[PDB]
Design a protein around this nucleic acid. Sequence first.
RNA 1: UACCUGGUUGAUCCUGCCAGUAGCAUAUGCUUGUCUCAAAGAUUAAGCCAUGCAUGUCUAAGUACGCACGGCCGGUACAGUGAAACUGCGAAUGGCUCAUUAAAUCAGUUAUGGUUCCUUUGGUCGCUCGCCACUUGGAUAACUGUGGUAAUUCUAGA
RNA 2: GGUGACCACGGGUGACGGGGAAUCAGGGUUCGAUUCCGGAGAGGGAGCCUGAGAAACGGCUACCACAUCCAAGGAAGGCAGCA
RNA 3: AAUGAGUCCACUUUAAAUCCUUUAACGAGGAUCCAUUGGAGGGCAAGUCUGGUGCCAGCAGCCGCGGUAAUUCCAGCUCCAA
RNA 4: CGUCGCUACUACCGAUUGGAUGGUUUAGUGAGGCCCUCGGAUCGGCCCCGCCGGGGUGCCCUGGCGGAGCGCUG
RNA 5: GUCUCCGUAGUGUAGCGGUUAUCACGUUCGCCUAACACGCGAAAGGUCCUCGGUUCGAAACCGGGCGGAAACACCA
Lengths: 441, 118, 131
Amino acid sequence: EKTHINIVVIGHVDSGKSTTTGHLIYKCGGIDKRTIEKFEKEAAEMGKGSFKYAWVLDKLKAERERGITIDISLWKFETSKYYVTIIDAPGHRDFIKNMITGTSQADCAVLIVAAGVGEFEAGISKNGQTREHALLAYTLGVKQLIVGVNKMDSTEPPYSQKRYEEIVKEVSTYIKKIGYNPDTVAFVPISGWNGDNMLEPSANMPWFKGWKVTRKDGNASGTTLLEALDCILPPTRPTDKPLRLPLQDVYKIGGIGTVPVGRVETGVLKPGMVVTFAPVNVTTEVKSVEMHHEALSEALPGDNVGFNVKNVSVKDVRRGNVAGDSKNDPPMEAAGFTAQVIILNHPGQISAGYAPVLDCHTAHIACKFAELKEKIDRRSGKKLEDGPKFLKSGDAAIVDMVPGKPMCVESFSDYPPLGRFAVRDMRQTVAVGVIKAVDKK
Amino acid sequence: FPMKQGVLTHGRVRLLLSKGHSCYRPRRTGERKRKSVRGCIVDANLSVLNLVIVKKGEKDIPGLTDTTVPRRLGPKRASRIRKLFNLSKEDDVRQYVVRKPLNKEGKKPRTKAPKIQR
Amino acid sequence: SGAKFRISLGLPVGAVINCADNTGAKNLYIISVKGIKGRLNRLPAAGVGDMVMATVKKGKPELRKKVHPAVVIRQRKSYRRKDGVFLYFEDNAGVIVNNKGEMKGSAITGPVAKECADLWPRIASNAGSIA
RNA sequence: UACCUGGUUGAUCCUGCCAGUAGCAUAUGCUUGUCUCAAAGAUUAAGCCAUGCAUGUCUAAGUACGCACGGCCGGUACAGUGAAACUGCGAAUGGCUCAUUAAAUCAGUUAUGGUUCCUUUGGUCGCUCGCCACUUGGAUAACUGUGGUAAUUCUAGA
RNA sequence: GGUGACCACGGGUGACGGGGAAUCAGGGUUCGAUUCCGGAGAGGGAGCCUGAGAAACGGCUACCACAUCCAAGGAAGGCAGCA
RNA sequence: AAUGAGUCCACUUUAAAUCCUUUAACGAGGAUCCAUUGGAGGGCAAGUCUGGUGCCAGCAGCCGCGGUAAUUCCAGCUCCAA
RNA sequence: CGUCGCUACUACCGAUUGGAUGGUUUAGUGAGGCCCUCGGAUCGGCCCCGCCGGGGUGCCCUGGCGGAGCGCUG
RNA sequence: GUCUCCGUAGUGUAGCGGUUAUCACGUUCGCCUAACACGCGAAAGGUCCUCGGUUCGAAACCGGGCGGAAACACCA
Ligand SMILES: [Mg+2]
Ligand SMILES: [Mg+2]
Ligand SMILES: [Mg+2]
Ligand SMILES: [Mg+2]
Ligand SMILES: [Mg+2]
Ligand SMILES: [Mg+2]
Ligand SMILES: [Mg+2]
Ligand SMILES: [Mg+2]
Ligand SMILES: [Mg+2]
């Protein structure tokens, strides 16, 4: 055998991300009936009954009390074609750094779109996140995604054809501008809470014939979301490149010590081989490797793996570092790096010096412009002007960067998933950039 | 939880079970372990009930009173075969033992007899 | 949903009840009961499942000279449970919570009345047994 | 290697301490090419522990009708190799740590004519007058079958 | 009655005892958790079966403190052994 | 001219390896294949050198040095001890 | 040389029938094991003996159903 | 992770949606003295932690993010 991929569910708040994910898990042999029965018992006890499927991933007390997805959670379910682990995005502007973290370690994306009256329009708006999630998925490097339309029973009248066609049209008209091809993007009308059109073809909505995709590699046409999950093309895994591990989270488990967990971007991880962490510059030897309560001898790229490094505390290595092989070339601190940012939506003028938060791979650290070298056209790296005084939305530019807090970044040519980054300010997306050059220490 | 004879209650109790009482085999010599046992009085709250027919009825129960399975292996003691075959004293005791005929496909057929004792 | 029926209160203002959680407090001195409008000369009284304002008289010194929200979990006064059952407990006991209902502590010693368990889910989770 | 030196005063003899000086024993800093030995979670927490292992055992010489193999030499209780299990022995040694403990432990000395002792070794085992002995009775393992519990090195009935 | 200024009794110990170690004119002063001998303990106490030998804890029973699984009816714990 | 420290075949060692000792073949002229740690007023071996600082920064176990010509600080050079 | 005034630091007294953490114990309650005195859920033997039976010759050598002697026993 | 509060000259830190100011110093600083010291004179000194929104314009009205300062949770 089985191949490993990663999927992230992105969408709007209250559009049904965690409930849909939990019910997809339950239908695909995730957890037995009585565990979810106890979950529903608890959900009825406090009051939030419809959030019972959301509880399979939203395990924290604060998330369960507020009924709000705060942090990224993992769960595994084996499908017809291959293994898959799902990234549950929060879906809030308050925790946008969290979903940037989550979206980075995912190969595909499921764009959950609400269909009920009012919720869809509120999602697609200046304060909405359905624009933001799709834009940042394209920014961080997720090529193939799928758009799923949820809450078919909520809309009036239930299971409407006109509603679904309008949703598909309105999603397509903007996803063309973002970059994804709706001909390659599969559109699936689903209902997670009811459990409609997910594992078996529906009976409440016979009007839906079936989605189709037109890719170069292979053409697919399924009826349910599971058939769409299987038809996702396998990613190109760069196994020969030197190993890199953007760190997701740190845990201190009783008796096995501190186990960093992160996605394998390049290289292969194996027990008994010394690793270095770029930002804190600490050397340590790997004891063992596992994944989803199962051990591994070889950790292939694009795998969420948990490995036990020896004699490093929980505080020394924290969220956002990059791990790598000590024998091969290591990730080193980036005192400065020349980045190619394209300004998307910034009201005020851009001068050299304002400090937005720049998120490279998993972590988020603000950085300051030192000087703007060249004003560059919107594509192809075509030079337009030398040394611009200020920058404005709707333009690309090569820029040299000096982070305030220490950070490690890698070029887009050496490791393509490392090179992707986004820029955030004004509580919005201000620029999209990739790194081409970087200075080490 | 199995039931134990002599508990004289309905429900479950905890008993310090020694060697050879019931519901317990000792791991090491002299070990006694406290265990939960159901009382001897039977009521509604049971999974199974063991019942052993003492006297035959008027007709035959299907699948129970038919196709009498034999006891596997005969008596091994010399006196225990003398009782079973009414031997007086040393009358072909060697050849009056029960011989077990075993047959398997690849096996070349053979009879089996026990090492008779005493 | 379902609302709590009326029960015999038997714990007026000034009653000292046991503190059944592991907060380090030994008793709770009830100073008022939540949701009591009142009546001339009538003492505000509480039954099981009632939120009260209480001060601990003996216990850890960092809890003593303060006012805490508490919930009564056991009472000695007999009360009817709508099925002809008159139930009473060995002692009057309550636990310290906040205004949102979750306990300051993490464990409860002894049983918890079913009325309190049904009305406060966070108390019911830490309840060892429900009577 | 039985050793001193600087500092109270304008200067001098003292008292006297401070400081210097050398070793070892813990930690730490910097540095480190070879080779032989070699300590190593004692000091604080005898604080808490995931996981895995650390105590099992058969000779000709107690009990084999498991086919689980197999010589049969073919008219025979048991050839033999042997799983499992019963029985016997071991598991009270070793290893770890130093919390408790101030005539207590412990060291040397002496006694048990005031005691027990698996095993080994050596004695003793016709010393007793008193209708199976050419060998007595019953049960239970392993084994077959029917199960119960979410679960255990849990077990029941036949 | 018995014991005490020939220091009882009580308290402290950052006390396991000893063989020994450091220092080294002689005399001494400190250190001995640590591989050999003896003792004690197995999270804290307590009580027992078996056995020649245990108040055993890689045996059991109960309480206390921690703490594992659970379908919440129960079940299972003891690294001051090697890692 | 002579050698190792290293690369490295084989033997040997060993339960099996490793290491040591043997032994092929490469392996040194800044032999750049680079010795460090603390000091240079006294105690206490070693500079009344030069450039900065100016009772500041700092040094200094103790006496003490530093307030614009520092044998004592920060450095270069040169010396001292192991 | 001392008071007084300012600034630090260190201890002391001090209402608060102060507070916290250990240790040893009185008293009350008291799990569990062990011992004794009972107890008797069950499991076996003898008396079996309603009988067919019976051989040294109704007088049984007993090869079994069966009641149960409704006692004596372990 | 989740909440609660604090975060303005170098400190002391008032504040007002039309103004971050002053104060005590600390320093600088003419000012003496060989040097002190003693006085004498003046000054500087603020992104209101920080970035935003609101707003005719806000440190402060609102929100974030960052630190601290408290809890509360956090077991492949
Ligand atoms: Mg025999
Ligand atoms: Mg009145
Ligand atoms: Mg014996
Ligand atoms: Mg001690
Ligand atoms: Mg010792
Ligand atoms: Mg010893
Ligand atoms: Mg012991
Ligand atoms: Mg014990
Ligand atoms: Mg010098």
